[PDB]
């Protein structure tokens, strides 16, 4: 039963399919390195924070 | 004669399983088993009906001719036959009769006189 051309026509499209989703996870893991980024960037102003927040008696 | 006809072909599909049979019966040497001129067949039927000039009355017979698809396979032999031939088609999805009712695929369906035959009501 079924088509072949039929049978082309979703390969192609599934194909294509992993490749937008493959492109983005790519794109997202590009976009968790620089999550450090400006996680560290803020690492200082925490420290110097509940450093200051010691909380007086 | 100068009236007007319309012909309703219901099931061109069935002919054309039928003359193969007819033509296998005959030994006839035979794409798909149907004949070569499996084609020719329905050429001849369909040319039959037209528009005859004001030289001859004005009369036409309008051809609605049917084709079974299996699965939906409009590429099918027999199909793509009935096509090359009809001025447009209206292709019916059962894909959709079970949303829009009247299964008329909206995409594929066309007419080829199209807009020369509605009125100047439904043209504009």
């Known amino acids: 039963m079924a088509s072949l051309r039929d049978i082309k026509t979703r390969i192609n499209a599934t194909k294509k399919t992993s490749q937008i989703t493959k492109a983005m996870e790519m794109v997202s893991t590009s976009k968790l390195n620089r999550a450090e980024q400006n996680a560290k960037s803020f690492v200082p102003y925490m420290e110097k924070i509940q450093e200051v927040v010691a909380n007086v008696a | ?124």
């Open chain 2, 1 to 124: 004669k100068g009236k007007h006809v319309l012909v309703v072909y219901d099931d061109l599909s069935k002919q054309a399983a039928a003359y193969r049979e007819l033509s296998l019966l005959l030994r006839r040497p035979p794409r798909e088993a149907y004949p070569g001129d499996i084609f020719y067949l329905h050429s001849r039927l369909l040319e039959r009906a037209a528009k005859l000039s004001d030289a001859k009355g004005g009369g036409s017979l309008t051809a609605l001719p049917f084709v079974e698809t299996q699965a939906g396979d409009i590429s099918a032999y027999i199909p793509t036959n009935v096509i090359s031939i009809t001025d447009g088609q209206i292709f019916l999805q059962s894909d959709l009769f079970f949303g829009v009712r009247p299964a008329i695929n909206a995409g594929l369906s066309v007419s080829r006189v199209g807009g020369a035959a509605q009125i100047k009501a439904m043209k504009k």
